[PDB]
């Protein structure tokens, strides 16, 4: 049983974790770099400490600085948040050696699920489907064809470049693609070695939330559809996913719990899947809290940050899978402070006037305030806008109202993009796939129409 917890993060997540501390009667300690001295999290905290220079490597990624800060402030446990050292086994082992409790999974589980190759191996061991692929180098075009027969076309040739250097839909196309992929890797990537993986034309990004305790009890807290993404960075997330059936939800939840228990998991974690044509494929596991935990948090009525802290103190799970029931629909839009219409290039500046939307079913998890100069040295996420409704339609309407009535004056945000998407017929129908943005450029025209002039 610990009384003071140190939050090794910044911005939105740090405030989110601190609020959980306050409700639980625990003291929260903030760590801050020189850039985030006038940051909201520092003030909210009961105590605080300079972790170091603005450089991330010398501040929030500096393990010794965080531990030293915990010793000076008397913290007994550390919440990593999302990002930085949250999935860093070295940080976990250092924290354990200092006598501190890590509010997260154990180091060994974190390592076993760290790399993409290790996780897929662990997932096949636990009977979780993975993307059909051969990670060892493919020598010639004939092996590609044979691997194409087993996997099922289309398949994708990639190099040791995460996305396919080339996508082959037929056996005939493999000779040209194999030649093309080899030069491209040799010249640029510098290694002629390739490998083959199954290709999904129009997948959907569906992830399963897993919560476990120190004593081997694990439960699945539902799904999330994080399909709308630019590049590979998520922009909109919703719960539940319209594409899943009640049976698939349980089937995937069971798979998630199997892997979590098999690896010895503790605390909160997220298993990410790809879903197409009624089939789900495991990709990776995040051994931390999820940025989009908010939607699950509102649909299943669970405070995951509080849950993380309790199991960290050693509590056995206070509920069972029968108790996990979804009610309503939640959507989250990321206020990422980047310029839409300009290839989401980072937008920086000072926020002048700040007025957050309010109402029933509206939540704002923010790391910014009015008259705040937004640090450029780190992330772009200013805040997260989350709405809840009785049905998906209600939640969308609230998100539409909240987006319009969110006032951020000094800096450009992607709020126009969100408004266009939430009006889009494809999104309204629940057909948004990973290729939603690429396939519908009409989004950016409407975004320009809704974009107030910012001037300087």
């Amino acid at each position: 049983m610990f009384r003071t917890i140190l939050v090794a993060n910044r911005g939105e997540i740090a405030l989110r974790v601190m609020r959980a501390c306050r409700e639980l009667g625990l003291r929260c300690v903030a760590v801050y770099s020189e850039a985030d001295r006038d940051a909201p999290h520092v003030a909210y905290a009961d105590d605080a400490f300079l972790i170091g220079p603005p450089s991330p490597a010398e501040s929030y990624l500096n393990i010794d600085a965080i531990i030293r800060a915990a010793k000076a402030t008397g913290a007994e446990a550390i919440h990593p948040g999302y990002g930085f050292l949250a999935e860093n086994a070295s940080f976990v082992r250092a924290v354990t050696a200092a006598g501190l409790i890590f509010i997260g999974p154990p180091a060994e589980a974190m390592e076993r699920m760290g790399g993409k190759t290790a996780a897929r191996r662990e997932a096949t061991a636990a009977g979780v489907p993975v993307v059909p692929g051969v990670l060892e180098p493919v020598t010639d075009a004939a092996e590609v064809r044979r691997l194409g027969k087993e996997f099922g076309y289309p398949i994708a040739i990639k190099a040791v470049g995460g996305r396919g250097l080339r996508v082959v839909r037929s056996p005939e196309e493999v000779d040209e693609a194999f030649a093309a992929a080899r030069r491209e890797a040799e010249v640029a990537f510098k290694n002629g070695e390739l490998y083959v993986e199954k290709y999904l034309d129009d997948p959907r990004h569906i992830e399963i939330q897993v919560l476990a305790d120190r004593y081997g009890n694990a439960v699945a807290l539902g799904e999330r559809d994080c399909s709308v993404q630019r590049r590979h960075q998520k922009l909109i997330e919703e719960c539940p996913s319209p594409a899943l059936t009640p049976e698939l939800r349980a089937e995937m939840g069971a798979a998630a719990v199997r892997l979590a228990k098999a690896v010895g998991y503790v605390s909160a974690g997220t298993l990410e899947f790809l879903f197409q044509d009624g089939r789900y494929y495991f990709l990776e596991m995040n051994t931390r809290i999820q940025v989009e935990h908010t939607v699950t948090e509102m649909v299943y009525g669970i405070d995951l940050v509080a849950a993380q802290i309790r199991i960290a103190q050693g509590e056995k799970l206070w509920f069972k899978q029968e108790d996990v029931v979804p009610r309503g629909h939640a959507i989250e839009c990321r206020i990422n402070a980047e310029d839409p219409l300009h290839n989401f290039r980072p937008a920086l500046g000072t926020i002048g006037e700040y007025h957050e939307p309010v109402g029933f079913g509206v939540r704002v998890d923010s790391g910014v305030r009015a008259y705040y100069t937004v640090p450029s040295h780190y992330d772009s996420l200013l805040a997260k806008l989350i709405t809840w409704g009785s049905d998906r339609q209600e939640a969308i309407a609230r998100m539409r109202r909240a987006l319009a009535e969110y006032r951020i004056e000094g800096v450009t945000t992607i709020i126009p993009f969100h408004q266009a998407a939430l009006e889009h017929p494809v999104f309204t129908a629940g057909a948004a796939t990973v290729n939603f943005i690429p396939r519908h450029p009409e989004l950016f025209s409407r975004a320009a129409e809704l974009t107030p002039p910012t001037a300087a």
């Binding site: 801050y32 520092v42 105590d47 605080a48 400490f49 300079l50 000076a72 402030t73």
Partner: peptide, 18 residues
């Protein structure tokens, strides 16, 4: 009279009543 003071890293909010 309100200022903020960092003693060897630790942030402290002070308020002097002259």
């Amino acid at each position: 009279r309100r200022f903020t003071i960092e003693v060897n890293g630790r942030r402290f909010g002070v308020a002097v009543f002259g």
